[PDB]
Symmetry: D2
């Protein structure tokens, strides 16, 4: 394997448990802020909206792609700027995006062993910092 | 041999299950976000909020009643057992009633006027069953 | 029968996804051409089975379980369901096989006493979907 | 991509119709090779397996990420090589991966307007070439 085996394994494990991770994460946010995450009937492209499960899955895939790519900042990639821009135009609140990704972190890291969690936590942090304040 | 109208209405509701359940759940959620949670929740969990699975359960139930011609006033054995199931789940009565009201509006909006008039009683039957004592 | 039945129905309902995945995959391994991936318009005439058909039938068997309806008399609902699928042009052999797969998947999760209680309700629906 | 807004909109549109695209794509493959795509979920980590819906959604997100990033080769990104490697170890055939991505292409492009399809097609081609060694 050219690419890191650790990374490939972490990515396959996150991919395999996508549903479990997204349920745990969304439910965790919902318990605390029920008004920020709707159960269905929101179009991803709808301006000025609450979170939906699709945002949770988007971000999970994104963090996995970064993990595989070794991209964890400090330089924000072109892709990551375009994502921020996409969400910018969607009008999805910054505090809520940050909180969704924090919930995915806790959900994802709980499934990993300690060495893998330590390796993976920075990639969540990268994406949380990226999706923050205004720009 | 059995009502073609009813079979057609049931097919149409079954086909648009996702669309109906999204609309219905979102409708309830906009008004009472704390009563309907995202994603999968253990259906058997006592003292819980609603999940999408409850919306789909009830839709299938109303469809089965429609197919069976069962719209009260006498409550079937099945329907009493369903109420009982939910009774033990500790799911609030007002919230169950409201979930089924939202499915009604969502389902009837897809039907033409004659079919809506035919189908509305089956929702009312279930809404009344799930409001007990 | 009442509390046992309610509990079995709750348990089947709770494990709907797990049951439907197991059942569909079981059919698919043996007859891949009879069950397609993802969502298909339910009303589309002359189609393959989809996961939604598996979930429909599971809910149906659960309703029968709750109602105590296991034949020999076929309920009007059950005849109308057969009719619905009849017009959809889903093959009879494939429907029967889908329900057999749900049986095996559902019964494997139950303890032996509950499996014995529940098996007849699957058999009822399989016989019903066969004319 | 004419404007950066066009790209953002195409990415939003692909994301929004993920389910519709993945159903169409998987069904398209399935009609031709039913033994290569199983229904409703397989353990993603299982060695020597058939395709599942999760593979279709993975690749769609990947093509969207490339679209947003402006990455359409010819040079393969590190991430893209790692993805190929991931699948390599999963024992999923090269011909089947290529075919899945071709199906997503046709499914995704059919939902776009013709101008947007012309813009988007290169990103699919990039990923198809990448998944071929
Ligand atoms: Cl908080
Ligand atoms: Cl709200
Ligand atoms: Cl009236
Ligand atoms: Cl048709
Ligand atoms: Cl996916
Ligand atoms: Cl145009």
């Amino acid at each position: 394997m050219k690419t890191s085996e650790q990374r490939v394994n972490i990515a396959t494990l996150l991919t395999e448990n996508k549903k479990k991770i997204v349920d745990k994460a969304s439910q965790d946010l919902w318990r605390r802020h029920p008004d920020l995450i709707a159960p269905g009937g929101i179009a991803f492209s709808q301006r000025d909206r609450a979170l939906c499960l699709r945002d949770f899955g988007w971000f999970l895939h994104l963090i996995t792609f970064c993990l595989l790519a070794g991209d964890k900042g400090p330089i924000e990639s072109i892709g990551l700027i375009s994502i921020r821009e996409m969400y910018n135009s969607l009008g999805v609140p910054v505090p809520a995006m940050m909180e969704s990704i924090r919930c995915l972190k806790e959900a994802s890291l709980s499934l990993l062993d300690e060495e893998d969690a330590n390796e993976t936590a920075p990639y969540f942090d990268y994406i949380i910092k990226a999706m923050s304040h205004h720009h």
